[PDB]
Amino acid sequence: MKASGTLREYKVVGRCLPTPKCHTPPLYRMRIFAPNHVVAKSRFWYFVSQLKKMKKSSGEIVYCGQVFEKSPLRVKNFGIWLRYDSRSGTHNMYREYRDLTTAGAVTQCYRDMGARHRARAHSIQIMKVEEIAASKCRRPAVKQFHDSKIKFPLPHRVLRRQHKPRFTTKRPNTF
Amino acid sequence: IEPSLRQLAQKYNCDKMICRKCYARLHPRAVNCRKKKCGHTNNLRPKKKV
Amino acid sequence: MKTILSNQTVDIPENVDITLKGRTVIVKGPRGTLRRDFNHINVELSLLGKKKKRLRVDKWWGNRKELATVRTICSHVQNMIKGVTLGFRYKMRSVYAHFPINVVIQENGSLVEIRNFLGEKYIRRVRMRPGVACSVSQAQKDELILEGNDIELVSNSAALIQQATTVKNKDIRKFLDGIYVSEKGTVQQAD
Amino acid sequence: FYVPAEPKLAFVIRIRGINGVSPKVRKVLQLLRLRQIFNGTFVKLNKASINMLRIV
Amino acid sequence: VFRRFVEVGRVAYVSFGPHAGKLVAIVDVIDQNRALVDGPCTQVRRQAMPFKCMQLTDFILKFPHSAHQKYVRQAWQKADINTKWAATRWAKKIEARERKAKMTDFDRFKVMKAKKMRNRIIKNEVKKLQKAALLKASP
Amino acid sequence: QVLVLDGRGHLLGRLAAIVAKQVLLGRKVVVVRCEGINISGNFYRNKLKYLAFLRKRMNTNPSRGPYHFRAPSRIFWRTVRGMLPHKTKRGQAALDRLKVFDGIPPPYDKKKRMVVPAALKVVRLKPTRKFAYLGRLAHEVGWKYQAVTATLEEKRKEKAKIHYRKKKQLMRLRKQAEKNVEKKIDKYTEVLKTH
RNA sequence: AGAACUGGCGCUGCGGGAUGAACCGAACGCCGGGUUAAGGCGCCCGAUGCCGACGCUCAUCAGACCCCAGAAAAGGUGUU
RNA sequence: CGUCGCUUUUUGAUCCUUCGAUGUCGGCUCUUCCUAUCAUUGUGAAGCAGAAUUCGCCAAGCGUUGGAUUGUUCACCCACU
Ligand SMILES: [Mg+2]
Structure with a gap:
């Protein structure tokens, strides 16, 4: 996967083809975070083939739909579970974020595993994601915004260079 | 001699730590050499008494 | 982490009145006046409250090694309250074997002229940072006293004597010779 | 759930060049009528043709 | 020094972006560089705007933390922001900057002729003060 | 005609990149007061990489070879020189519309000077990181005109605080007028x- | 030094990799308009002169893009 | 006992350039460069009392000779420093 732009959650269910040995296979469900519905039904077969004896030639997906959030306008706390590969070994890792939506917190994770651990988007697996509440958070970068009557200014503001005249007689005050 | 003044001058001259790598003269409760030449190492030994 | 702000406050007694030009801190007290400029340190200084005169230094956002620098502001500020109301006094004694260390003062406290340091013919004229002055002590042997308002001008000048009386080419585990500081106190006491 | 019929036609274009090409994977492009870069062809979807498109 | 903070209720302007020139009210901050805002009476609904896109003013609003759309709307108009915004010297600067921007070719002729007329009258009455200044300092 | 750029508070290569594009395009550019140009990174680091430049010297005679200039007007000039195609005649003329000065000369102490917000230190550095002045990395390496320049600037800046005295004297008058x-x-x- | 399979170079220009036998794109009659590939867009030097997004990093030897043109074990209360 | 490296002043290994020719040892003369520092400057550590040594650091600025045997490079000895 490349994990391009903002990601997008998918509910991908699927079953393996009916054999003479097992009519009606149990048809498992997954929760795929992917850029579009072609990579999502590809990564469905990456994880299902790790757990069951299913593979895309002996299976079919029966539904791949975008599941989106039930409260886009509510500030939530997302603690997620990772299984990235490093240069020496591989590691399990709990890692909190904070976003309006479910699918944008896992976008913020790939941007952050690549930043802090150089972990590319293929060598990283998402175990599970849920909204957690306050007093169950561990990370103080997330915890410090749990503040009724939170306030801070914006010191040393800088933006809009060369869009203004590139040569002026006016030193730009940074507030 | 002046044994109180003996211990006062020994505060600046003997009661210190010596690094085995950067050979510094640090302070008697160091854990690290402060010099970048040894990469702030953590193998120290006290200054050798008379 | 880039934390939301930290702040220390400085309780200021009434006999000292602090004004600020910005990140400059002007400290006026009984025994003079002294100032510092903190225009390199990227913080705001707000002196709040009538009748009580609290000084709150707070740094918004900031990284962890710029969280370590808000405490350094308030510690230099307290040493300006202390130095302008009580002064600083570093008492240094002369530790010597067989050769006595002769010490005089040439010019008004601003020059200390050390000679006979371990039998040497070469004099050691140590000039001091302006604002401090010397005194040969009384009722104690071989002692020198340094008094002034700024702790960085007392203590750096105290280090110029202790560095000048340095034994070369010899063992410094024996040959304990020099004029080392003995005490870190104030000029006026018990306040 | 209703899963539909997986499709019977496909459109294949060629996005790579002529030079530096293995001998099995240029025979099939010769059989798909994909000789130049950026040539297209409709392909009947069959098990024999799905395994031709996986070679290439 | 730092006279205006972000805060729940702080009415911010929006400089650039797809909601440029309209006001918002900061409802909730999410993390460090984005904030959930809405304008209930100024046609920019509830969404996350970054802080470098917004533009803090001197107006606060008193409503509970992360309320609904209605209680921001009641607080927007019990304070009467949109009347109080347009009667400030910075809403007049942003209005005048787009009056000059739509000044047509005939109107720019009239702005010319009625400018060199008053620049004469100000240069006459500032030179009739230069003569009056030396006559004061002649004694 | 000519843009007049006051050089202080600017960075070395961010300012020199904009000048070396405005001067291929046919403009005349005068960079003034090059003594005050900043350069990012602490002073000892920028002074090392100029001393490493000084040992670059052709062995058989140094009289032919790399010409290590020492005034900051020529340090900035050689930075612009390395961003221009100076071995062609389209680039020979490009170096010749650039009159970079040191201090502020008598044609240019009475013109309005522009700055470049795309190369200012305040805009472009993060403030917890250190910088070097081009005035005293020139002085530490062989330049002998720092004190006679600062003397003439504080006489230059004193003749303008009386100009700005009587300029806002008129502005007070014509606001009351x-x-x-x-x-x-x-x-x-x-x-x-x-x- | 010697084999296997495939491609290429030799016989082959062109765009890129600053430089180049073989790398990466793409193969070539003579031209106009359009659009891309690989690679790029501070200035040499065409194009980010976007009010680009999130983080990491300070080097008194910083880092900087396949082949590829320089490094290891070991260590750091340096910071994440 | 291990084990990871660097260097190209050793010797190999290889056979790319040169067979219509690149004059092949050593010394003498002479200039420059490197640092992995013998000495001289400033230093830290000793099982540094002093004297003398020893081990590290910034550092190539400035020096590093006179001879006997030998074609010698290398060696080895006398003497000065
Ligand atoms: Mg390939």
Whole structure:
């Protein structure tokens, strides 16, 4: 996967083809975070083939739909579970974020595993994601915004260079 | 001699730590050499008494 | 982490009145006046409250090694309250074997002229940072006293004597010779 | 759930060049009528043709 | 020094972006560089705007933390922001900057002729003060 | 005609990149007061990489070879030189519309000077990181005109604080002169279309 | 040094990799308009002069893009 | 006992350039460069009392000779420093 732009959650269910040995296979469900519905039904077969004896030639997906959030306008706390590969070994890792939506917190994770651990988007697996509440958070970068009557200014503001005249007689005050 | 003044001058001259790598003269409760030449190492030994 | 702000406050007694030009801190007290400029340190200084005169230094956002620098502001500020109301006094004694260390003062406290340091013919004229002055002590042997308002001008000048009386080419585990500081106190006491 | 019929036609274009090409994977492009870069062809979807498109 | 903070209720302007020139009210901050805002009476609904896109003013609003759309709307108009915004010297600067921007070719002729007329009258009455200044300092 | 760029508070290569594009395009550019140019990174680091430049010297005679200039007008000039195609005649002329000075000369102490917000230190550095002045990395390496330049600048800046004395003397006057009367008819149409 | 399979170079220009036998794109009659590939867009030097997004990093030897043109074990209360 | 490296002043290994020719050892003369520092400057550590040594650090600025045997490079000895 490349994990391009903002990601997008998918509910991908699927079953393996009916054999003479097992009519009606149990048809498992997954929760795929992917850029579009072609990579999502590809990564469905990456994880299902790790757990069951299913593979895309002996299976079919029966539904791949975008599941989106039930409260886009509510500030939530997302603690997620990772299984990235490093240069020496591989590691399990709990890692909190904070976003309006479910699918944008896992976008913020790939941007952050690549930043802090150089972990590319293929060598990283998402175990599970849920909204957690306050007093169950561990990370103080997330915890410090749990503040009724939170306030801070914006010191040393800088933006809009060369869009203004590139040569002026006016030193730009940074507030 | 002046044994109180003996211990006062020994505060600046003997009661210190010596690094085995950067050979510094640090302070008697160091854990690290402060010099970048040894990469702030953590193998120290006290200054050798008379 | 880039934390939301930290702040220390400085309780200021009434006999000292602090004004600020910005990140400059002007400290006026009984025994003079002294100032510092903190225009390199990227913080705001707000002196709040009538009748009580609290000084709150707070740094918004900031990284962890710029969280370590808000405490350094308030510690230099307290040493300006202390130095302008009580002064600083570093008492240094002369530790010597067989050769006595002769010490005089040439010019008004601003020059200390050390000679006979371990039998040497070469004099050691140590000039001091302006604002401090010397005194040969009384009722104690071989002692020198340094008094002034700024702790960085007392203590750096105290280090110029202790560095000048340095034994070369010899063992410094024996040959304990020099004029080392003995005490870190104030000029006026018990306040 | 209703899963539909997986499709019977496909459109294949060629996005790579002529030079530096293995001998099995240029025979099939010769059989798909994909000789130049950026040539297209409709392909009947069959098990024999799905395994031709996986070679290439 | 730092006279205006972000805060729940702080009415911010929006400089650039797809909601440029309209006001918002900061409802909730999410993390460090984005904030959930809405304008209930100024046609920019509830969404996350970054802080470098917004533009803090001197107006606060008193409503509970992360309320609904209605209680921001009641607080927007019990304070009467949109009347109080347009009667400030910075809403007049942003209005005048787009009056000059739509000044047509005939109107720019009239702005010319009625400018060199008053620049004469100000240069006459500032030179009739230069003569009056030396006559004061002649004694 | 000519843009006049006051060089202080600017960075070395961010300013030199904009000048070396404005001067291939046919403009005349005068960079003034190059003593005050900043350069990012602490002073000892920028002074090392100029001393490493000094040992670059052709062995058989140093008289032919790399010419290590020492005034900051020529340090900045050689930075612009390395961003221009100076071995072609389209680039020979490009170096010749650049008159970079040191201090501020008598043609240029009475022109309005522009700055470049794309190369200012305040805009472009993060403030917890250190910088070097080009004035004292020139002085530490062989330049002998720092004190005679600072003497002439504080005599230059003193002749302008009396110019700015009497410039805002007129601005106080013509603001009280516009207080008076009867120009309201002309302010009807200018306030209507951005006073 | 010697084999296997495939491609290429030799016989082959062109765009890129600053430089180049073989790398990466793409193969070539003579031209106009359009659009891309690989690679790029501070200035040499065409194009980010976007009010680009999130983080990491300070080097008194910083880092900087396949082949590829320089490094290891070991260590750091340096910071994440 | 291990084990990871660097260097190209050793010797190999290889056979790319040169067979219509690149004059092949050593010394003498002479200039420059490197640092992995013998000495001289400033230093830290000793099982540094002093004297003398020893081990590290910034550092190539400035020096590093006179001879006997030998074609010698290398060696080895006398003497000065
Ligand atoms: Mg390939």
